[PDB]
Design a protein around this ligand. Structure first.
Ligand SMILES: N[C@@H](CCC(=O)O)C(=O)O
Ligand SMILES: N[C@@H](CCC(=O)O)C(=O)O
Lengths: 435, 435
């Protein structure tokens, strides 16, 4: 059959395309004369699927939506310590205040606002890196997530470099407080090229997806970024991506996202989906009108909110079989704290916090563990307590476990270490050595 | 064996308990003379497990950590429209500015700051509700999540009511802009009692857990709040819970949390865990010092970050068996967009977005779907494409699916509707009618 998601994408494009409020970025000639009658949208899933509709294969400059990529690239090249000394974590409106830099800190508020982006571009490769290297580190980091070699639209670069007075101002002010080493024109030029990189609504959906999964590319399964770096970038996208309207956006939508004045919008909901939207005309605060609306919809119709839980839970426990003398534990999925934590409940729930008198209700509910389990979501863990409803051997089957982060390994290891201590054998049937 | 989490909780209490910086709330006599040598912590899981350490069963006033409960209660009693007209969604520092209310809006910035809390207390039952009802609606909503009838510590209430000049000021100012109907003293009194409700570090962990799961109580599986309301409350806790330091907190920790000046801290990470911490002494901005640190740790050691993905993904597909003429699909877990979306991939992947030439790398990776699957986390969906590696009947087994939200139902329904349209039989073996 044909997948229903792309069909949904097409319906949304037609419904919201009935109109076209706002206007194109007027502070640059190349973006003013752009056709406002375009509008695409893509959804890239963690697994590797890509759904689309409308003008999702038309190119446009990534502008600001490029900020989380260079922040991520710079974090890897210099590490947290070095980047944090120049870029803060406080949300702010693009309107620049010098008091930002007078603080004991001496650093722009965050990496989503121009001042913060200029500081990040300056940190790109190292202290002795040339102008030319930083700009390739930019195009490179981005290109590695989009999946292909990207290019800079010099026509836009030149158009913007001719009227880049504001940014030069932020760059100078920054040098004044020692946040920038090199020259103002040098970092501005590199920053203005970085924003001139061309992407399609689809690339953004795939790039957003890399950040969504913790640094894993959904089209190859190859780690592009460390989970810890990808985490922070999505953290700052959420808290400062929509500027002073971030509180209202985190509640109204739930999708960490940065918008570009060329019309593009990037979205990345941790562990669920990379998003890309494209619609030239900008609203009253500078974002992509139809683009920002597209996200509202997706978020309401699919409950794609950051606060809408979607864990594995006890579902990490495929099943618990007490054949007779030995008990078999088969794990499944991607095991992190959530899953490993449930495993530890299973293991403990084999015979190897509240006063029942005070909570008659909780004891009753507990009496029926199968019922209380489905109402809550702990897969087949209740099958452990049921196996013990002597055990001399426990088998940990890991054939169905896609992967397990460090925290899971340690937690399940410790779990194993504590069983043997009980005079219980423990065989870990783990084929593709993952443990 | 003994579960390793509580042991970890005890280690953390001893390690971080080596010290005790800051001091108790000095603007109230009853909280100034409180013993600073106490410190507990609890973790309530979605499934129904409760882990503890230290003074987790000692009572203390919930103060501000009560704000998300009354905001949630008021949202249910009056609905979004009515509450949003009085309470905004913008983050802010407790330092009050009158320009907040001059805006076209005429409403405090958010429901986590005193002004915003006073406005929420005023909306508690209805326009014709008495002073006495609102205060019970407060204690009630909270008590229903903690799992037991709670009480107001009048000793603290009286102590604070004697020096409640600041709050009265916020209350008056609000009446001035028409955000409060009743009297200033009336709402202040009710608000000061609401903060005098006594909880233990454990109750907070269970209460945080209700919000964490989308409104489902982890100790009974009974829905206490609508998923949509629980969502917003966690959204505003995240964006404004830590005030002007929320950007740095969302990155440094990732756990939506509100602190109380009595020493308690509430945490609620969507779909993973309810948290409770208790440590009388407050730091330089008013939060619980050791309490705020406890959260930092938990978040770093267990990767309990809001941005650290933890989905079900393709793991919703237990397996795909092509016995021969018919194909069997067994689903599992709690199915939302994430899971339902994978099902639709399975169904479509039975023979009933990118240019391969451009992405040689992606085609290679795709060639080995089993490998690309484990690197990414899509359970056993690749088993569908493998079944078709004619099909006249497809069986949807739902015995292992704990539950499925509205979005899942519609998505899997549509999926079903599109298969039959292909001249394919479709039997949904779903025992406890969930579909
Ligand atoms: N590329 C623009 C930024 C566009 C935006 O703010 O989205 C600039 O450097 O000024
Ligand atoms: N109960 C205190 C608030 C404490 C806090 O801000 O955490 C008050 O009403 O002023």
């Amino acid at each position: 059959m044909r997948h229903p998601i792309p069909d949904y994408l097409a319906s949304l494009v037609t419904e919201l395309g009935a109109v076209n409020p706002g206007e194109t970025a007027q502070y640059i000639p190349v973006l003013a004369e752009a056709d406002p009658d375009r509008f695409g949208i893509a959804l890239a899933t963690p697994t590797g699927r890509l759904h689309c509709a409308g003008d999702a294969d038309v190119e446009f400059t990534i502008q600001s939506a490029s900020k989380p990529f260079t922040y991520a690239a710079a974090l890897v090249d210099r590490g947290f310590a070095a980047v944090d000394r120049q870029v803060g974590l406080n949300p702010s409106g693009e309107a620049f205040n010098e008091l930002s830099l007078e603080a004991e800190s001496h650093r722009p508020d965050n990496a989503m606002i121009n001042a913060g982006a200029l500081a990040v571009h300056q940190l790109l490769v190292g202290p002795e890196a040339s102008r030319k290297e930083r700009l390739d580190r930019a195009v490179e980091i981005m290109s590695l997530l989009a999946g292909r070699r990207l290019s800079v639209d010099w026509e836009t670069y030149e158009s913007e470099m001719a009227v880049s007075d504001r940014n030069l101002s932020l760059a100078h002010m920054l040098r004044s407080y020692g946040v920038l080493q090199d020259s103002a024109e040098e970092i501005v030029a590199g920053y203005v090229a970085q924003c001139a990189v061309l992407v399609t609504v689809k690339d953004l959906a795939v790039m957003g997806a890399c950040l969504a999964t913790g640094g894993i590319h959904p089209m190859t399964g190859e780690r592009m970024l460390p989970s810890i770096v990808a985490r922070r970038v999505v953290s700052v996208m959420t808290s400062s991506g929509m500027y002073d309207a971030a509180g209202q956006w985190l509640a109204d939508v739930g999708i960490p996202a940065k918008s570009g004045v060329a019309g593009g919008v990037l979205g990345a909901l941790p562990g669920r989906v990379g998003i890309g939207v494209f619609s030239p005309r900008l609203d009253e605060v500078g974002n992509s009108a139809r683009g920002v609306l597209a996200c509202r919809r997706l978020s309401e119709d699919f409950r794609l909110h950051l606060m809408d839980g979607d864990s594995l839970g006890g579902t990490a426990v495929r099943f618990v079989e007490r054949e007779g003398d030995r008990v078999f534990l088969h794990l499944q999925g991607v095991i992190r704290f959530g899953g490993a934590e449930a495993v530890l409940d299973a293991l403990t729930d084999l015979r190897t916090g509240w006063d029942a008198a005070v909570y008659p209700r909780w004891q009753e509910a507990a009496a029926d563990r199968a019922a209380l389990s489905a109402a809550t979501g702990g897969g087949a863990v209740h099958e452990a307590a049921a196996a013990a409803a002597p055990i001399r051997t426990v088998v940990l089957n890991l054939a169905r476990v896609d992967r397990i982060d460090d925290v899971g390994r340690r937690l399940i290891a410790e779990g194993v270490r504590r069983l043997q201590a009980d005079g219980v054998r423990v065989e870990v049937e783990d084929p593709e050595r993952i443990l």
